[PDB]
């Protein structure tokens, strides 16, 4: 007999104590080594419910990643409209590492192993687990990078589908590699390469998975104009902040060719951690490169009294908690009394 619970969880990672990289430095003074033998108990004849959208584990990771960037990627100037804090700006070795989340004494984690678990609802396959899988705190918009993959079909995640402005998390079952690079002109000029045939295939597969829910024609369109972090593919690569134009990825005219998305490394950004803006030093020297798995897509549907046949979807993230949701969705905490 056990019901729900909410507790201050602890973290675990294979973080090296000698590494200069800040994800290791943070997990060295905040986490412990991973558990060698992860005992998992496939408790069958069990049926309990989960909710990724009301999961406090997502709130805890949001804190830990914010505090990580706070002591690591220290912005030179920070704005909240009022507070104008001005700090030193040294460069940093940056590369996310897996982060396991586990429970204290008395509490424990339940994992829903139904391979089509859509985020909310009951599961039969539920096992008694001890820690979560190694999640890399990759912060990004539009495209989920370097995460886990849906084992069977594409999982369309949301809180209320048939309600309009609620962010969608498309969980792909096959990765599509994206290869972003700043060469060695302009130091801020950069670009990502991505195979068009494979991106067309998966976006076609996502369009079919969207037709199973809504009996209409699915169309992709670039966002009409929010902030730059929402309209473009915004991600952090080795400290430097990339803004990559994805018009060529979400215009329904994705072609055969290897697509080169124009990118830029901007110094003044809007902060994902909270309200306000930050400023960082100009980018480092040499060649800056990040090769990433695209494991998920963040979408927002075009609403309105859609007696129209076409249903338009546009890329947009914004809420970084949803990034930790697409990895922590299969984890609910309980308490044995």
């Amino acid at each position, epitope marked *: 007999v056990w019901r729900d619970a909410d507790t201050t969880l602890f973290c675990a990672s294979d973080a090296k104590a000698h590494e200069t990289e800040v994800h290791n430095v943070w997990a060295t003074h905040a986490c412990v080594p991973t558990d060698p033998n992860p005992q998992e108990i496939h408790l069958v004849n069990v049926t309990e419910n989960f909710n990724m959208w009301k999961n406090k584990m997502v709130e805890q990771m949001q804190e830990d990643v914010i505090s990580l960037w706070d002591e690591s990627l220290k912005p030179c100037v920070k704005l909240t409209g009022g507070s104008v804090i001005k700090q030193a700006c040294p460069k940093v070795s940056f590369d996310p590492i897996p982060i396991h989340y586990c429970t204290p004494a008395g509490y424990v984690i339940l994992k829903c192993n139904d391979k089509n678990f859509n985020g909310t609802g009951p599961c039969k396959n539920v096992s008694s687990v001890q820690c979560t899988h190694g999640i890399k705190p990759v912060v990004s918009t539009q495209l989920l990078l*370097n995460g886990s993959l849906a084992e069977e079909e594409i999982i369309i995640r949301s809180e209320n589908l048939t309600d309009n402005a609620k962010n969608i998390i498309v969980h792909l079952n*096959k*990765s*599509v*590699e994206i*290869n972003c690079t700043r060469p060695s002109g302009d130091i801020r000029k950069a670009y990502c390469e991505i*195979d068009g*045939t*494979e991106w067309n295939k998966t976006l076609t597969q996502v369009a079919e998975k969207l037709k199973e829910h809504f009996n209409k024609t699915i169309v992709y369109q670039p966002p009409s104009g929010g902030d730059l972090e929402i309209t473009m593919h915004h991600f952090n690569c080795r400290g430097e902040f990339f803004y990559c134009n994805t018009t060529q990825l979400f215009n329904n005219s994705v072609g055969n060719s*290897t697509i080169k998305l124009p990118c830029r490394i901007k110094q003044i950004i809007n902060m994902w951690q909270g309200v306000g803006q930050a400023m960082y030093a100009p980018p480092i020297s040499g060649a800056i490169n990040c*090769l*990433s*798995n695209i494991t998920g897509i963040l979408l927002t549907r075009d609403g309105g009294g859609n007696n129209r046949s076409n249903e338009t979807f546009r890329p947009g993230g914004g809420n970084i908690k949803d990034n930790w949701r697409s990895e922590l969705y299969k984890y609910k905490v309980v308490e044995i009394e």
Partner: antibody
Amino acid sequence: EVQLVESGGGLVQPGGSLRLSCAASGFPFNRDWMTWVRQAPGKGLEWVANINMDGDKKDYVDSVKGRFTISRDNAKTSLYLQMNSLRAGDTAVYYCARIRQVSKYLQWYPGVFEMWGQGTMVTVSS
Amino acid sequence: DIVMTQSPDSLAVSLGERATIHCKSSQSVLYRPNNRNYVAWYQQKPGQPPRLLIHWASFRESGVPDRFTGSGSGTDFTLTISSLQAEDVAVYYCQQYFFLYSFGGGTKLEINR
């Protein structure tokens, strides 16, 4: 320049044992995968074994598991292949080759054989 | 294990003419997330160790002339020599490195003069 020099090799009785060595120079040997590949006289190339920078990752061709051992000495920049229970099918020219890493499954895997030694002849006969 | 089968087993091409060598993999060596084919071509001149010509099916190593061109995808690969030269007489091997390693049987390229 890059230089891989195989050593050992010669006549071995059937069922005997032999150890080959590869003296490498001219490249960060302690950071590269290395491999052994053989060619029986008149026949084609057959990959034998390979090993990573730190010696913890080794792989072998099936007809060789159990009686060959690939190893390395990064302090000596040398690759080794201990052969036991040799038979006529092992008579070949054994090549030492440098492996170039390649992206596969978003990780670093051993790839093409970018540089080759001249080879040493191993003869298994009565 | 992946098996590579080359064709033809041998051929004789006049100087300045086209030489075509095919390679077939038992299963697909095409990794779709990056659209890359894990196939290489090697050249073995008489009395010399093999020499890497082309990696990733279609990418030439530095120094290798333009007349060598690799192509194909999935399980069907081809090495083409556009205008054959005397120095091209050798045995050509294809190799897959998708799962471990394995070589093709080899293709002996004779020159007709």
